[PDB]
Each structure stands twice: as C-alpha cells, then as structure tokens.
Ligand binder design. Structure first.
Ligand code: UJV
Ligand code: UJV
Length: 440
C-alpha cells in the first residue's frame, strides 16, 4: 500500500498580512528572475537537505527530553494536472518570527528558480504553536496569515514555471532524488512510495563501522566485486570539515587513465576529479565536506589536506604490516613514482617519496628499506644518499663501483623498477641529502 501525508488540510480564516522583502533579498530575487544559468534540478536536493535538518533538530530535542518520537519523514508529491511539486516533512517547523525574519536562504532562491509562486505552511513543534501560511510570487512582497489544519513541520508547494513543468512528473523527480539525495538519513517518500535510499556510513564515528559495512560500501562506490585491501575513514573538523572514506582495491591496477564529492550527504559531483592529486586516482571512496561552494582555493586546500592524510596513512600501514605494505608498493608504486615526477613543489615530492621502498646493500636480499631508514643509518661524514639502478640484486652487487664502496661501509640502495631512475632524478634530494647514482 501507499503511505502519503500530503493533502490540502490547511485553511485560512482571515486576511493575510502583507510584508515587503528586504532590499538585499529583493536584489537576489531579481538575479534569479533574470538568470539563464539553469542547473534547475538542484532545488530538490536543497529542499530535502533542509527537511532533513529540520527533522534532526526535532529528533535531537525530543531525545534530550524523555519524549516519545513521532513519525519523522520527508514526503514529495508531484501533481501534473496542477503543475506543482510539494515537499513536506514532520520536523521542527518554523515559528511566525522565523517565517518573517529568516539554509532558509538556499532553499529559498532555488525554489524561485523554478516557481511562479511558492505556498508554504509551517507549524513549530513547540507546544501551543500556531500554524501559518506564507505566500510569495517572487515580487517584493510576501504574505503571512495564521492557518488552521497545519501539521507540525513544514510543507512547501512550488507552483512551477511553464518551462519547469518537468518537475511535476513523478519519473523525473524520482531520478533527481536518486541522483543527488540517495543518502538522506530520514525516510523519504515520493507520491506515497518509499524511495530506495542508502546509509551514509562516512558520517559514522569510524570505530562504529564494521568491515562488512566497508566491504558493501566499497563495492557500491567502486562498482567492484573484490574487497578493499586498505580502508581509511578520515573524519576531521579542522581546518576543514571532512567526513571521508578511502579504499584501495585488493586487485592490482586500466585504472591508469575515483571519489564522490558530497556536502552533508548531498551529492555535489559523482566523479569529482580534482579532489585528490592525480597520483592518488587509484583511491576509491567518498569525501563529504560542509565547507563546499571549482578550481577554488577551497578545493585546492581540501586536496592538499587529503594528500597529507593519505600519505600519513600509508606510512602508518607500513609500520603496522610491512609485508602487506610491500605488496601494496609492488602493486601501486608506479602511481607514487608518477606523483614524484609530476609534482611541482619539492616538499610534495619528498612527502610522496616517504612511501618508496627499496632493497639495500645493508639488508638481506628481498628486504625493503625506506629513504628515512637509510638516512638514519648514514655514517658521520657521509652526507648523500647513494643508489644503483640495476635489473636485479645480483647485477647490482657485482657492479665494480658498488664493490669498491663496500670497503668503506657506505650503504647503497638497489633499485630494480624501470622508472626508479627517473623518480630519483626528479626527487633530487631527500631530507637535505642529495640522491646520487653510483654509476653514471
Ligand atoms: C538546524 O537547521 C534547521 C533548523 C530548523 C529548521 C526548520 N526548517 C524548516 O521548517 C524547513 C525549511 C525548508 C526550506 O527549504 N524553505 C525554503 C523556504 C523559502 C521561503 C519560505 C519558507 F518557509 C521556506 C522554507 C524546507 C523544509 C523545512 O522543514 C528547516 C530547518 C533547519
Ligand atoms: C663510488 O664513488 C665513485 C667515484 C667516482 C665515480 C665515477 N663514476 C662514473 O661513472 C664516471 C664518470 C666519468 C665521466 O667523466 N662521465 C660519465 C658520463 C656519463 C654520461 C655523460 C657524460 F658526459 C659523462 C662523463 C668517468 C669515469 C667514471 O667512473 C662513478 C663513480 C663513483
């Protein structure tokens, strides 16, 4: 059966009171009316986001009391024969003061992007609150009147413009909801039918997400069938709001030609390249930041924060399980080398270089060392990092130049990957120590 709450229960006994929009609001309404910039479908995800916020505010306050929880739901209704789309939620609602004084910005301008007029009913969840009707056609006036039959929460009826009638088709609205609003955290219904929505596990505290939940989400966001070999659930609130999960696949890398971008569980970009550095394009997963608006200073800042955190994560993994990290470096190490070569900043080159692992003349065959570990073994008076590129360890060890160096205890990195020469040429130095090939 169907489950709908939207219907014409409201009535207004008296006359409305007329108010004039304040000057800046009127100016923004003028921009909307004249704007041809028309990613028009966005109003739906903003209204759903505001409904979700209103529901959470109610739920938290009732839980802070001993109070039972009512039905907390978001409903959409389309009406083709009347050219409307309606959203209604059973959240905290608005007082008359807020309807006159006042998120209320974002829901407002995008509604008037698609509306000839907007008809709102709201009733605060506070006990003894009255219901109100708010009306505007986007001119400099709005109307408010006390209304009977308003359900606690907020209902917004958008009377669509003649060129926006597509949003009174159920199938069109269904697709918009699924595209941008699939992870809304309260039950969502369209025309009485429950929408298939998913759990935004990146918002949970990382200690609460189980491996089976990560495996299901990884397979979903990567459209994969393996499991992730690594999982980084990164939550921070400074300098930026970040709720993110990053996976690296169990399978090897073609992946050589990403990460979805959200803002409080609202999709911004399905496949947001530019959010990670190019060399991290093998990462799958999701990044959610409240701080999001396009080659902005903010995106650059988020990218640099995430790069540092992922490098730290991989360093941490090498300490937790060196054998698993060595396999990761074997499988994904060409991305690290690419990043060193293409990086502009020396500090970024050296940060990525902390992930490189090489054999060494000082270690058993097959055992790997990092550049930092090599540096900690350098003997006083010797101030450079020496390496030798060769096809295998036997050929490196029988270099006449290495053999001579053995006499004075100098460690030499043994590098067997064909792109090691270019990587270490471009790195040039590490921790103020020049990288020098022992053969020219
Ligand atoms: C904690 O944050 C809170 C705290 C309390 C909150 C109450 N809220 C609402 O009652 C509400 C507002 C919208 C909305 O987008 N608009 C846009 C309008 C334009 C003109 C006139 C209007 F009445 C409009 C409303 C949609 C659904 C909602 O439930 C949201 C909240 C969010
Ligand atoms: C172990 O410590 C040492 C100590 C000394 C070392 C010298 N080493 C050399 O490889 C070397 C270079 C040259 C030279 O003049 N070259 C090499 C060129 C290659 C390309 C283009 C050019 F123009 C070149 C000019 C001559 C003899 C050499 O043995 C490794 C060393 C290692």
């Amino acid at each position: 059966p169907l489950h709908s709450i939207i219907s014409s229960t409201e009535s207004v006994q008296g006359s409305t009171s007329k108010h004039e929009f304040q000057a800046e609001t009127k100016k923004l309404l003028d921009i909307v009316a004249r704007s041809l910039y028309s990613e028009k479908e966005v109003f739906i995800r903003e209204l759903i986001s505001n409904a979700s916020d209103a529901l959470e505010k109610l739920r938290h306050k009732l839980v802070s009391d001993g109070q039972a929880l009512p039905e907390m739901e978001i409903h959409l209704q389309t009406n083709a024969e009347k050219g409307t789309i309606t959203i209604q939620d059973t959240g905290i609602g608005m007082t008359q003061e807020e309807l006159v004084s006042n998120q209320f910005g974002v829901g407002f301008y995008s509604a008037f992007m698609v509306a000839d007029r907007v008809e709102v009913y709201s009733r605060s969840a506070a006990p003894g609150s009255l219901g109100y009707q708010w009306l505007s056609d986007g001119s400099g006036v709005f109307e408010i009147a006390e209304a009977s039959g308003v359900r606690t929460g907020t209902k917004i009826i958008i009377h669509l413009k003649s060129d926006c009638k597509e949003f009174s088709s159920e199938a069109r609205v269904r697709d918009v909801v699924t595209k941008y609003s699939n992870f809304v955290s309260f039950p969502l219904y369209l025309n009485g039918r429950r929408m298939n929505t998913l759990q935004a596990i990146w918002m949970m505290d990382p200690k609460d997400v189980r491996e089976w939940q990560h495996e299901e989400f990884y397979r979903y966001v990567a459209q994969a069938h393996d499991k992730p070999r690594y999982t980084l659930h990164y939550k921070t609130d400074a300098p930026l709001n970040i709720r993110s999960i990053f996976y690296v696949p169990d399978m090897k890398p073609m992946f050589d030609v990403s990460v979805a971008l959200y803002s409080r569980k609202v999709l911004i970009q399905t496949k947001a390249t530019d959010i990670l550095p190019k060399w991290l394009r093998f990462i799958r997963g999701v990044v959610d930041s409240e701080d999001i608006p396009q080659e902005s200073a903010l995106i650059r800042k988020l990218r640099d924060v995430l790069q540092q955190r992922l490098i730290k994560f991989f360093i941490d993994q090498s300490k937790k399980d060196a054998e698993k990290y060595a396999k990761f470096f074997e499988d994904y190490g060409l991305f690290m080398r690419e990043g060193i070569v293409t990086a502009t900043e020396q500090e970024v080159k050296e940060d990525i270089a902390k992930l490189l692992r090489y054999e060494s003349s000082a270690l058993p065959s097959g055992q790997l060392t990092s550049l930092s570990e090599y540096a900690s073994r350098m003997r006083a008076g010797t101030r450079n990092i020496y390496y030798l590129c060769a096809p295998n360890r036997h050929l490196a060890e029988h270099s006449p130049y290495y053999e001579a160096m053995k006499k004075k205890d100098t460690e030499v990195l043994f590098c067997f990957e064909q792109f090691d020469e270019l990587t270490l040429l471009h790195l040039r130095e590490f921790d103020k120590k020049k990288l020098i090939s022992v053969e020219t």
